[PDB]
Amino acid sequence: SSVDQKAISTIRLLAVDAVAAANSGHPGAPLGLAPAAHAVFKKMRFNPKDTKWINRDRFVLSNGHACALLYSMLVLYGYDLTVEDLKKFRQLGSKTPGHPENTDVPGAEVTTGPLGQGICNGVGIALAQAQFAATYNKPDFPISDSYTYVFLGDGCLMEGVSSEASSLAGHLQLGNLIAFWDDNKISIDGSTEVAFTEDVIARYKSYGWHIVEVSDADTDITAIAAAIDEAKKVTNKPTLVRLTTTIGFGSLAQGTHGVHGAPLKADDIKQLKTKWGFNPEESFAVPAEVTASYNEHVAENQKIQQQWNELFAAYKQKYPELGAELQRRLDGKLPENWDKALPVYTPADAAVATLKLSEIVLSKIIPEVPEIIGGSADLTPSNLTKAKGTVDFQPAATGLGDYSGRYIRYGVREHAMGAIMNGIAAFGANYKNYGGTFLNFVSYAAGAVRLSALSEFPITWVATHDSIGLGEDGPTHQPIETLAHFRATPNISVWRPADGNETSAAYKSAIESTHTPHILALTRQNLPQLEGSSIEKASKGGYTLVQQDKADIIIVATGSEVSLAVDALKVLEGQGIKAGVVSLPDQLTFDKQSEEYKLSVLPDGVPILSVEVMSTFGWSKYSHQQFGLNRFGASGKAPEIFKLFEFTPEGVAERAAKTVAFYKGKDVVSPLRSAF
């Protein structure tokens, strides 16, 4: 008889009807988690009319297949999502896709569905909130005091990425994070008894999490609310709330794996409706008493945001500098002329490894841009990712840092680092955050990297030791396929800078980015400062480094192979062959230039040879012939590896001469040309 009971029924039946309309999707977890969703959203502070309010509590559905539940909450609370949108669940072009997308769904903080990701994103949102609060809060000014609420299931708990992030979140004492395990004993294959018998609670205690168990989460919303209150009292541990639920609660098939991921039968939906007091002939029913009850909570939350806006106005009066910084960040704007801090080099400067140039850039721009934070996956002395004079992000209680710190010790946790970076970006406030590892092990985090791209998050991988140039660690460490993989992923900027100026351009792009993740492929070995490079020119993604009006061939190269191309040009000169050189530090940035610009760099009428010491995949977009490395590497001194594979001035010159011969007497059009 209570409106709470009616709301829970409404949520359950909206979710079931959405799945029924699509004849596709997942009704089980929505039915089991509706009580908890109702309780959690009633405790959350949010404004459906301002999804960007920086002191909102955040909600993350890590078990993203359950998104009919999320969409039902967003509709009932009056986000920019309607019952008509629910009726278009899983339909082409709708705002209710089969897994939630932050780019398409108002109130979806992150893109989830791939299991394990959301809980790690929640760790990142909570990490950002802690850093943000430590940076801006003052006595009598709680600018940031929000919580991060995550729903997750058994699948998320089995995925290693969540173990990584949970270990780290416990270490970081993130008391702002409250996660809820849907303990329903069912996965796709059937009972969890067949593959998942670990003592989850004991594991989470071993990470340093607090635990609250709710033995009847099907009905006991008082206990769920009390569990949230208890979690909030434990300020130095993230909390896991165990929700013991019946998957598909109410269905004839409740408590079975069949209700996990298929639409319910028509008669099942009828009996669900009738026993909960709804009309079995009606779909998408919304009792006005439910939206009125919810509208009241919205009104209270809107009053809280109104007061927060006055708090912020008073803060800007008392702390004009910090307040202006905060306003700028909330407006999405970097500091004026921040890029004047970028290092600039000339050909008179010494050769430097681009991982070391990266260290230098970070040391200059971190002091100038407070919204840069980042870390490394236990490779700080090798990636060179920490700026001297910064403090690590740690709980002060440890003595090892502070929450105001700017450098994160991720440990050996590449995948969670990638998904945590997504959460930090998702927090907002213009965070431009980065994560260091060896390029070859960015691949450990592929699940998260592709979601950076799909989510349009401006995260940055500082991906060092990019090739066989690293030498002795050998083929287990040497990328071959890696750049092809990420360049083939839509919306990833993959920078491979050749020298100091190009490394500054790469960081200019990565930090200015608002919608595109970056991977910066950086060398262990020293590279010369190039004649002809500049930040301005490299900012175009691809540019003419050596212009040769009478070119017999153009060599297009990236990174460490640009200097090699220039040396090959000198060899070719002695053989009577004139070459130009194009440097292509980022293929995506280049692709986005005008057709006329791109054709000025890669014109018609001249054969083009690409040179890059890894896969030739993708390179036929830019070249007629490709010199790359399509086998695994080798353990040895790097110069000897390059000699073995003929990535030498003479070996490049030989293949350039063969390319010129191949096209002798034939017209050649730019590789940029296509039939459609």
Added chain:
Amino acid sequence: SSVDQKAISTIRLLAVDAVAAANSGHPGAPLGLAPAAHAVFKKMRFNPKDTKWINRDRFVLSNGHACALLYSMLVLYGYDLTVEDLKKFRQLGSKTPGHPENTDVPGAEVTTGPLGQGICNGVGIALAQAQFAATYNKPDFPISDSYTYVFLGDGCLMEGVSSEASSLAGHLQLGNLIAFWDDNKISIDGSTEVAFTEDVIARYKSYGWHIVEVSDADTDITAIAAAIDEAKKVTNKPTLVRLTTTIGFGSLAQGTHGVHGAPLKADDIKQLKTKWGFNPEESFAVPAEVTASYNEHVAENQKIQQQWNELFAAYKQKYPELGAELQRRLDGKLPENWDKALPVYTPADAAVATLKLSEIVLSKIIPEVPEIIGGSADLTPSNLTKAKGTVDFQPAATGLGDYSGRYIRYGVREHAMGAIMNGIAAFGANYKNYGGTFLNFVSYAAGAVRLSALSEFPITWVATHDSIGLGEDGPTHQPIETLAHFRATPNISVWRPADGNETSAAYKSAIESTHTPHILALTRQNLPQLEGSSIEKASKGGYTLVQQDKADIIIVATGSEVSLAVDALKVLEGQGIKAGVVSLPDQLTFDKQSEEYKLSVLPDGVPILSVEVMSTFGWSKYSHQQFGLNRFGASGKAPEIFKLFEFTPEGVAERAAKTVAFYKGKDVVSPLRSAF
């Protein structure tokens, strides 16, 4: 004064001298783990003169950067690895690469170095041993009773893949597995206090592992041996032995992160040698008392193998059928004419999804080929990877299966499944093992997949839901980059079969493979049986499906797009354009054919258009123009997605007609031609 002490010193100094000769590598963990390595190898049964003895104990160095330790053991025990090879540590072309490679190093069971992988490989070796023993052991015939010993460090314990595999190994009660944690409190960034403060022991107990703690693993080899004995008494739990060690034990820099990954200073090496009784002027010292002591253990082990060979001879007398099966498997040979079990289709048969065709193949070949085992990462009802009438691999104690079972419930653990598959292959005995998930989430396991390729292991991914064809789950589930990523990786066979006959060819390749991992990209949606397909023709990787002697264009396609290409051919016919069709179910298999065969499929003098509903990367090897999908997908009904992106007979025909126009009046040579 004991020879044990002298052996430990010898091991330590061989490792340090190897690193010193290379001026590259990792001396710290070798110094800390030499006592444990000495103790473990003394308990292990192995034959340095027969690295394939199927009842050997296996050793895995998961902390593979410590490989100077492994190489020192292999040299001292008289494997096909010498002191001269140690002097060439980390040098181009040596048998002592900077991380161990099973393809290059005698006695290296797997390729390790990428952290977390080795312990998961050990779980797989132990899983295979349990299955193998349950299949072949009889009363009085312990054909298989070997153990799997793994060394791992803090890094491995932080990588999520090891959590996945450890949860599963505990569930599977793998009492044959004994792992050793190098608890030295140091990672690359410094103390583990900065990022890794979890209660490891409590976590491993939560998985159901047994624990033995060795508080002084720097010196107490009696306690290490006793820990092994204790582990062997606990037959229903894998055991974690906590080795509390001093990283770099003996170095002036012992117990610091500087000794982790850089050569020791010359004076440090001198004082190490002098205080342990060695000559500081001598490198690569091997006291004859150490190799004599080790040679005795080898002799005992060789006697054990000699007896095992007689046991096996007696087994073949008593159980001629099982014995002949076992002999065949140990010879590396599949059953005679096993491939007669492969299903064959004609164009009169119904349309079938290739994931369903895969189910049918498995149902026919699993009964015929006992060395096939496999599983799914909690997608069994969606991948269709279990053959009816088989039992799950589980401990009998659970009631859910038996160790003789053939179907593995991996849970939602793609990355560990990939690395466990590598371990099962590494066990030997001709295991041909497979793992099912959605293609898009094979990417979660990229770290392990690339090691399958580098290790030359014939594992198979059953990778369903391969494209936008899956429909409503949307872009979080729909591959775009995935095939490009794995095709760009050396030595991966990436099959994308178009119909029944091609799906049988893909399995023929995957099961016959001895050195090449396979990924089978399979559809959710139904595809027609093609006129012109056959197992024989598809076994060539690429073949002419529709031969058109007067072709204006050839359309080359894979998988679901072959039928689309054939329908486009019909549209083109009405526009006066003659097309041929090539089906390219595996690019690697095709690439390995003769140049004349490849040119017969992709000849000179005709424009070639590729069609595949994902990245166009790689396709310029085979086509002049490429029609693919280089943006993310969409949540909707699959046919509507295909229409939106113009993957329709008319849309393909339009781009084919534009391709013909583009080359009108120009000579065209095969894309297979290259200048070098």
